[model samples]
Target: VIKFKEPERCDYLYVDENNKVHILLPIVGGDEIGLDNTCQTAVELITFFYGSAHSGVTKYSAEHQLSEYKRQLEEDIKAINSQKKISPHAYDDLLKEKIERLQQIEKYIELIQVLKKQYDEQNDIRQLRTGGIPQLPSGVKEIIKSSENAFAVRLSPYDNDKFTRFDDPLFNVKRNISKYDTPSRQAPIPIYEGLGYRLRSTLFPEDKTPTPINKKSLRDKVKSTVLSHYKDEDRIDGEKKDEKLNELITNLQNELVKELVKSDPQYSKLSLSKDPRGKEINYDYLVNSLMLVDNDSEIGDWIDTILDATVDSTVWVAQASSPFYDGAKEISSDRDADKISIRVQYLLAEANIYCKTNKLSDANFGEFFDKEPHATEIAKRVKEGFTQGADIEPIIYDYINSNHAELGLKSPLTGKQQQEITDKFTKHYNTIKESPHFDEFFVADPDKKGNIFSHQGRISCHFLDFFTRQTKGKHPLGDLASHQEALQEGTSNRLHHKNEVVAQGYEKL
Candidate 1:
């Protein structure tokens, strides 16, 4: 069964150089419900199920919370009619801590799965989700970095390194842009980061140009795109529709090959000094094009594709205030309107990224999203042994095929079957495992792109407990791509993330 271990609880904050203010505590497991709204939500649930709210951000609150979670969930799930009068609500008072942590894990697993499903929908507005691109005045500029698992943006000159998307910040995501007088040089405007799609910066050959074509074009495109979105304010009464069309065209520019030029090395060699040579420029269209424009490509299909989720016009992912999302707002966010909007934390989205990049089954996805069947089913499956993200069927197939005789299996595979299984390997990995599908899973992802045996496991692995040091123990081999890859280095199987350091883990998923 999925080892019923209590996952550690954590308490985090978005300090501005900041102070106070973040997830669903009762329903979704997180470091802590630090933000007022989210914490308040925790309080509401606590009152309903148990007896109290966590006192403060007690340093070890996470550990304490994880302990209590088991008990609180026990109370929450208990049928009040039969089991009357829940008491003191102490940490070790109710169900076992192991079972509680799993329930907590399951709470969040459903949350993230919901998000993935919502965003996965072609009609879902996630494509339009943005942290609201910063429209800085004067010297201030916006800086952004992409994690293979997500994307982050910051404002320059100050707080550029900090992200508010997943954090419970002072100003939450409410209708209209939030602004205030600051104690420092600039009042902080929230720039967002996100756990998003599978994409990477352009890889061009002989990028002799001082600035690559894609980069320059991207800058120009961003300006034009932003301008297009705002420029409609001045349109004439009759020219209104026409002006709106411009914005529409810019939207298309983001999803099509408008800025990218067909680049061939031959062109780069010829008066190519002036001619650009970036294969697929980093625009929306080129990004989803698989480096080539094809009629067969789905315009807005979001999956293994490389379209930017942080790609926003002005407003990013709209959550609070809307009739549709307001109900979801509490769980989506943690803070109050004035303090923070704990909307869409990276951890929640990371669940899906873990699934997509690793190519998990849809049923497994429900294990993380919808609780019912999966919660119960996965619990049972975790028994045979469970690991997060991706399936190890390929690895297991490879290993078992090699050792079926020794393993004492009734029927080993035939030669054709082995060939068929080998072909399945292609579906899991990129043509080259150069880097995490997200570009960088965590900060210290792979940089070197040579050798597979050392890089991806040469003649690698069987559950015959897979001779690897990890499975050699009672620990069942995990399906996670990171788990498989991490053991080769030094961190963990399902990814071991230190407080701040990446260690060998693939970022926080």
Candidate 2:
């Protein structure tokens, strides 16, 4: 996706079939057209002042030079209406035509306004300073950039109370208690042994005590006795044993604490550093980082893949118009309108079927088409025709290639160029159809799901393979997977998983 420093700075490029590129400016204002003040002014000038009999020329001129046409048309129409020179039906008819044209203009204006509003709202100026911004992945950027539209997404975060319970359980014994209660039992006394016979028994239970020398002087005897018995080996052994036992108990207690901590649902294991407070501990951080920087990233790659898939699968179909252009006029032939509606509906159904078989959501084209009244109305018309068992293909093709051509962007392709494009798309579609990825799309068995790690993986293994074969590998697929993965990982490490906790310590009471 293209990242911009600011919303206003973001722009889109549309290349027509003629190779002429159009740079669209942000548009605004819907209420101006709905008011129909311009149309009213045109009617007055035409009726009273303009003597020309050609309404079409007058209308076209009025559109080209709105202010001048309005002034002149009002004066002429008023005069004509006042003198009763024209029939009431004719005057009304003229007025109706002007109103319809004005409404169409208004719809275009509204669309522009929506786009501008979206651009202004979503573009972030703060992020633009680092590097050259890339172009947007696809229509997602377009939708986000548009001011006139909104998107609805249902986010299921770990489902119901799963995260809540895991992160903050109802019972956290460690956190709930502040101090331990005193024990009822008294402390046990440490045992000690004496010297001489007791000392001999402690040191070497089988050895006998040595006899005192009778011939030696008193001083000499005292010195020898003191030298031999200076260190209390038995007492020292007892003290050392006690100390070792204490150390073992302390270590065991620590191990128990670690085990208990592991069992706690709130414990996080994603820390990347020895310092607990300096590392990240959540899965969100890990996933988000992956999305931003990993080479084989799933989320980032899918964003582009899905966008391209959507454009390819559903965008070419034509959309239907509603019975009423605005709140004013009702369609005369309900039967025809119904037929048109059904054809559009069938197109959407086909797109949806393609998406389901391909393992994707209904393409973004359908989502955008559904918002237009014209498309919705056409769909209704098509549905009505199906009940009557009418041949719907002609109507479908006509509406798609003609009436709904603007919606399908027919101006972007035509004649031989259009045919060639369609053929190419079909060829690609068939190739994808026959590929292993097609069957793998519906594989629910985890082990048999193929080597594809993500949407990108599947596309690379299947679509890229087809493309390479078609081009004799001269046009190799770019390694977007690695770049995308790295970007995601960098972002994640910078944001969520940088600083995380590893362990905690406590003292025994």
User: Which candidate has the top score in lDDT?
Assistant: 2
| Candidate 1 positional error at 387, Å | 56
Task: Give each prediction's root-mean-square deviation over alpha carbons.
Answer: 26.9, 38.3
Q: What are the TM-scores, per candidate, against the unseen true structure? A: 0.16, 0.16
Task: Superpose all Cα atoms of candidate 1 onto the true structure and report the RMSD in Å to 1 decimal.
Answer: 26.9
Candidate 2 C-alpha lDDT tens digits along 1-509: 11111111111211122212122211111111111111121222222112224556542221233333334434544544664554444445434333433333333333333333443244321112221422221222232222111111111110111111012111111111111211423321211221111211222223432211122222233223333433332221233543532342233333323433422433233221212334332223333543322223332232232223222332223223222111222222423232222223323333333333233332333443434453444444443443332333334434545543343342322344333323322333333232221100111111112211111011111122222332333433343213223322321111111111100000111
Per-residue lDDT, model 2, residue 357, is 29
- On the 0 to 100 scale, the lDDT of residue 11 in model 2 is 17
lDDT per residue for candidate 1 within 295-332, as digits (tens), equals 23332221112223323232222211211122221211
Which stretches of model 2 miss by more than 4 angstroms?
A: 1-346, 349-364, 403-405, 408-509
What are the Cα lDDT values of the candidates? 0.25, 0.26
Q: In terms of TM-score, how similar is model 2 to the real structure?
A: 0.16
